[PDB]
Amino acid sequence: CEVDALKGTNESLERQMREMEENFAVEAANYQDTIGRLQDEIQNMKEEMARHLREYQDLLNVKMALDIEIATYRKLLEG
Amino acid sequence: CEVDALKGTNESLERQMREMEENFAVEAANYQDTIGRLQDEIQNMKEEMARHLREYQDLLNVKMALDIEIATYRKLLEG
């Protein structure tokens, strides 16, 4: 009994051992991938945002140049 | 020594697993914290981006209105 019981105990522990190491490896992989994918988006978004700020600043610059034109075209027209 | 061998191996595995179980638990727990934090950041950024796009839209409207208005003053001069 004692020997065989220890054998059954040993069989279970090894099976659970493998299952466990296998599963933790898979889940850790997925968690990691997810975090990687998210870190990438965050990164690409920051880049996208910088490009947007620039597009805005340039539009505003064109807009402020148009203001000068407008004001002068009116002053012209009184002629 | 084949019953001392099993009691030895078994008790070894039996605690190694207790180890893994406890360790992964905390690790996964932290993985989930990160993932959530990153998703929340992506959302906050998306919102901020949204706000910026609105501001950009108002400005673009103002600039186009100016354009139009200008074309006019340049015709009210072309005769």
From Swiss-Prot, chains A, B:
There is a cross-link at K46 (Glycyl lysine isopeptide (Lys-Gly) (interchain with G-Cter in SUMO2)). It is found in: Cytoplasm; Cytoplasm, Cytoskeleton; Nucleus matrix; Cell membrane. Induction: Up-regulated by muramyl-dipeptide and lipopolysaccharide. Residues 1-79 form a coiled coil. It comes from the Eukaryota. Signal peptide: none annotated. One of the most prominent phosphoproteins in various cells of mesenchymal origin. Phosphorylation is enhanced during cell division, at which time vimentin filaments are significantly reorganized. Phosphorylation by PKN1 inhibits the formation of filaments. Phosphorylated by STK33. Phosphorylated on tyrosine residues by SRMS. It is linked to Cataract 30, multiple types: An opacification of the crystalline lens of the eye that frequently results in visual impairment or blindness. Opacities vary in morphology, are often confined to a portion of the lens, and may be static or progressive. In general, the more posteriorly located and dense an opacity, the greater the impact on visual function. Homomer assembled from elementary dimers. Identified in complexes that contain VIM, EZR, AHNAK, BFSP1, BFSP2, ANK2, PLEC, PRX and spectrin. Interacts with BCAS3. Interacts with LGSN. Interacts with SYNM. Interacts (via rod region) with PLEC (via CH 1 domain). Interacts with PLEC isoform 1C. Interacts with STK33. Interacts with LARP6. Interacts with RAB8B. Interacts with TOR1A; the interaction associates TOR1A with the cytoskeleton. Interacts with TOR1AIP1. Interacts with DIAPH1. Interacts with EPPK1; interaction is dependent of higher-order structure of intermediate filament. (Microbial infection) Interacts with HCV core protein. Belongs to the intermediate filament family. Vimentins are class-III intermediate filaments found in various non-epithelial cells, especially mesenchymal cells. Vimentin is attached to the nucleus, endoplasmic reticulum, and mitochondria, either laterally or terminally. Plays a role in cell directional movement, orientation, cell sheet organization and Golgi complex polarization at the cell migration front. Protects SCRIB from proteasomal degradation and facilitates its localization to intermediate filaments in a cell contact-mediated manner. Involved with LARP6 in the stabilization of type I collagen mRNAs for CO1A1 and CO1A2. The central alpha-helical coiled-coil IF rod domain mediates elementary homodimerization. This is Vimentin. The lineage of its organism: Eukaryota, Metazoa, Chordata, Craniata, Vertebrata.
